[PDB]
Amino acid sequence: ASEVRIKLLLECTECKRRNYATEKNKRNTPNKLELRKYCPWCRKHTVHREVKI
Amino acid sequence: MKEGIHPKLVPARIICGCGNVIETYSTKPEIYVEVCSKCHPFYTGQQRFVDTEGRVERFQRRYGDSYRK
Amino acid sequence: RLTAYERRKFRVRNRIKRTGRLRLSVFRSLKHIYAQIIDDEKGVTLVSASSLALKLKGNKTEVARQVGRALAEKALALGIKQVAFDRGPYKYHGRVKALAEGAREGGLEF
Amino acid sequence: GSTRNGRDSQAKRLGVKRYEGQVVRAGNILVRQRGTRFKPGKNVGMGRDFTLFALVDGVVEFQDRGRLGRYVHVRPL
Amino acid sequence: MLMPRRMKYRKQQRGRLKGATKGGDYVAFGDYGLVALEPAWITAQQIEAARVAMVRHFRRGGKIFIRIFPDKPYTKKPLEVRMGKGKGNVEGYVAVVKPGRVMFEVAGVTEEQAMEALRIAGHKLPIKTKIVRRDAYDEAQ
Amino acid sequence: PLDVALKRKYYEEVRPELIRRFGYQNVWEVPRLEKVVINQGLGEAKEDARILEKAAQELALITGQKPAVTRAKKSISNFKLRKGMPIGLRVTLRRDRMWIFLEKLLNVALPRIRDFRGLNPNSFDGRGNYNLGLREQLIFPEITYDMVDALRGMDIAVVTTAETDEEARALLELLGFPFRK
RNA sequence: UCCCCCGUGCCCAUAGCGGCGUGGAACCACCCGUUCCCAUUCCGAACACGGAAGUGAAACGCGCCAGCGCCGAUGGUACUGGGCGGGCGACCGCCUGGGAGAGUAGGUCGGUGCGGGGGA
RNA sequence: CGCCUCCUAAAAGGUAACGGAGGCGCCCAAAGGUCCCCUCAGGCGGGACGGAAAUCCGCCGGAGAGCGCAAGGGUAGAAGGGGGCCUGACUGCGAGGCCUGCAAGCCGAGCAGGGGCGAAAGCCGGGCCUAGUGAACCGGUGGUCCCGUGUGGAAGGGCCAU
């Protein structure tokens, strides 16, 4: 991690809970991450979005 | 072949300046060229185009014999 | 110095053996198509099926499917149900795919 | 006068943890190593750090297949 | 004088001097030889002194073959420092020499000349030596 | 397959003359053309106007086949070369297309070379293949002055089943490749 | 049960490189095609399909040859577990048990299982 | 001054010195998963601009190349190179072990939930591996809706995540 390589949380888009922490490079990957993840709240995979740590 | 990336090959006539005509294939049906194997010097036996000289120089000057012995 | 063929062949066979199943191996010549179901623990073939041995006919694909069903038949009769498909150096497609679908209809489990 | 040297890293305790003939249980670590000095053989898994371990309860066996490398097997009991 | 043009490492641990020569035990180029009777680190300077004396005996003529080479770096702490604070600096290079080694050979020169040169050269070496001449045993190795 | 004159010339005139000249005991032993591989080593497109879609077009007209791009194996300083950079084209002519190309190369292109005094007798492999380099692409009947932005040459490999230079010469010469000496 | 070939394994070069020879009935390949399935960062080269006129040229299979490669004793030695001596030292020896590496002689142009197909 | 790699280290493990040499305090949205395909450096020969080295063709070439970075081990029967689809860079756990004074560190089959790739066998709980790190205390933020000082709330806390 660095000023450019940041930590971020992934929020389930259906129930709004942050379910995963991970990291990315914001120079290489400026758009907010969107990833399908398993939401344990929703009990199903859900598109999760990068939301600020 | 893969579709949509390759120019078609069709029967094509290449016409040279000698008046030669070639039955071949191309991406263009009719082509006119200024030279070919039928009329090119190097090809045409050894057609010594413009310079059939035999050097001509320089022993071969000969003007003349009029200096005396 | 191996060839793309020798490599491809190893690479898929290696993965298949790793899983420990009986292996349905497939040879595909210009004309025919053969099938051994092999036990690699013992180094042994347990059931065979060939277009050569079945003196089978014409369209290679249709033929494949036939050896396919043929193999499964002698196979279930020996108690063999499950098995792993060894596409050898061959893309799973064409005659091989056809052979595979045939051993499937035939009741082979994979 | 002084030294630009002076450091070293912790030992990693690598190597075989169970030798041929030894009775193991499912999960037992058999080999600890860097890269594939021994390859997983019959009933032997390999973890992400090349660690070899028993897949079943059984007995360890080593096998040297020449150019194919060396192999750790576990033979069921 | 003799030293490596390059090395992977600047300093070498000291090691030991047990045993007879590993090889280098038979005459292999010239006619007469100088063999080490006892082990030592032979210094580059000592080697060069041995050589020079031999060419000096020959004046003009002969061939000298040098069969030992100083690739071992010799280290020493600066004067008067105390123990610790790192390893000494390289001060020279030695060639490790265990008993039996043919260190030098000469060829193309009379016997009385090869004898005397190797004797004088011997006096420059910090070990006991014997002069040998090529036998069949040399030729059979 | 197409009836193309040079192809036929091979089977009719060259085939037999060769069997005469070297006395083959086998139909397959006699020299065949295998492939003609044309390459534009380019890299005049490294950065600049790395639109050599222009050249890929030109080659596609000449050979009737769309070249594929080549890119640098390693990064190189003095040529200004970062690894992965598009520096060349390569179109691999086989079969009918190979013949059609060679036909026009021999009949029309080589004639149109400036001060053409014959192909090089020494450009032979030693395993019996031939290579030859062009300076311009205006040589081909398909590419007019009007349509070209800048002069670019190419490398032509002609690959034979011959085992020896000496045999491969006969094949290409008989097909009509003009050699200077 | 023997011979040839096609698959697939095992031993892991005594199996390899090279030179020579040989095989197409069968099988295998190359081969003929590129409509069709499928395919080329271009290419029916590959992969893939449909084929059966040809050829064993390539590949492959099987033989033969020791130039290279690989294998390699016996003998002796180095070294050494244990036990003893000597030397001021660098170091050196004896006993008992183990015993290389190099090298020499020599060996090798593979051996073998399973299933198919063909032959006697 | 912590951490990694090699040597010292006496062929298990471990092993010191202000002994001999080098690295780390990152990174990668692909440089991750899976399916499919591909194979190197280098040498000789041949080929316009074009050179020791750009790209192309031929032969030889088992790995000396590659693998983000030090070293080592590993590795083409791929861990290397290319492409397609993807987010397992899972959630709930976890048999059994490695290591080990503690606390840490490490590996992990399997079952369940919901997925990815694959025809399938199957693989996938980040990365060929070993560095890329920091206990507890105090506090922040999202969630939960567990406690709530007579009672209902609220304040404040707990719990899960960071």
Add this chain to the structure above:
RNA sequence: CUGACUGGGGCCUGUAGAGCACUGAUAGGGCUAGGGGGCCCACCAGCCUACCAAACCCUGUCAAACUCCGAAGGGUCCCAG
């Protein structure tokens, strides 16, 4: 009865020694790019070298951080005393 130690058996190892196949070092010779120098030139190629010398080869060596090899021993488990 499981111990130290010992007997037998399997597996693990990279040291002593040795080697040079790898990484490097290395004397000499051979062969041969490359330079230096001398003939002969600037018309661009030649030729000669008891000079320095790459790669390769032969002879002969060196290495804690080299290993194609490689012990004696050591470790561990099983049976037994």
